[PDB]
Design a binder for this molecule. Structure first.
Ligand SMILES: CCCCCC/C=C/CCCCCCCCCC(=O)O
Length: 133
C-alpha cells in the first residue's frame, strides 16, 4: 500500500548529505553544487509499477520498478547498481548493491512530510520533502 507516498514533493531540509555523498566517493565539485540543489521528487504508480522521478537544476533521474522485484539502476552519481524497492514497516525501502557495497534510501511519512534517510557506510543523511499541490 504505497499510495500516501504518491505525488510531487520538494526538498525543504537536508542533514548530512555531504557526508553521504563523500562516503559514496562523489567529488568535491559535485558535492558543492548538490549541497545547494533542491530537487523535486515525483512518485507515480501504474498498478504495482512505480516510477520515481528526481528533478533538479543539476542532475535528473528516473527509475521504474515493480515492488519487490530487482532492477538495474544507474544513479545520479553514475554508480551501476542492483536495486530493489519494498514496503517495510510502512516505509518505502530502496536498497542498492554494487561491488559488495550497500546503501539504503528509506522514505517514511511523518506528520505529512516525506522523510528520506540515506545510509552508506556510517553516513546517515536525513532529507525532508513536503508535498506540492
Ligand atoms: C537527481 C538529483 C540527485 C540529488 C541531488 C544532486 C546530487 C548529485 C550527486 C549525488 C547523488 C547521490 C545519490 C542520490 C541521492 C538522492 C537524494 C534525494 O533524492 O534527495
Amino acid at each position: 500500500m504505497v499510495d500516501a507516498f504518491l505525488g510531487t514533493w520538494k526538498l525543504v531540509d537536508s542533514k548530512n548529505f555531504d557526508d553521504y555523498m563523500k562516503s559514496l566517493g562523489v567529488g568535491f565539485a559535485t558535492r558543492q553544487v548538490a549541497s545547494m540543489t533542491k530537487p523535486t521528487t515525483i512518485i507515480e504508480k501504474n498498478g504495482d509499477i512505480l516510477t520515481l522521478k528526481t528533478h533538479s537544476t543539476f542532475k535528473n533521474t528516473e527509475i521504474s520498478f515493480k515492488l519487490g522485484v530487482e532492477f538495474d539502476e544507474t544513479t545520479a552519481d553514475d554508480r551501476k547498481v542492483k536495486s530493489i524497492v519494498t514496503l517495510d514497516g510502512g516505509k518505502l525501502v530502496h536498497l542498492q548493491k554494487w561491488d559488495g557495497q550497500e546503501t539504503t534510501l528509506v522514505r517514511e511519512l511523518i506528520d505529512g512530510k516525506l522523510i528520506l534517510t540515506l545510509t552508506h557506510g556510517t553516513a546517515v543523511c536525513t532529507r525532508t520533502y513536503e508535498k506540492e499541490a
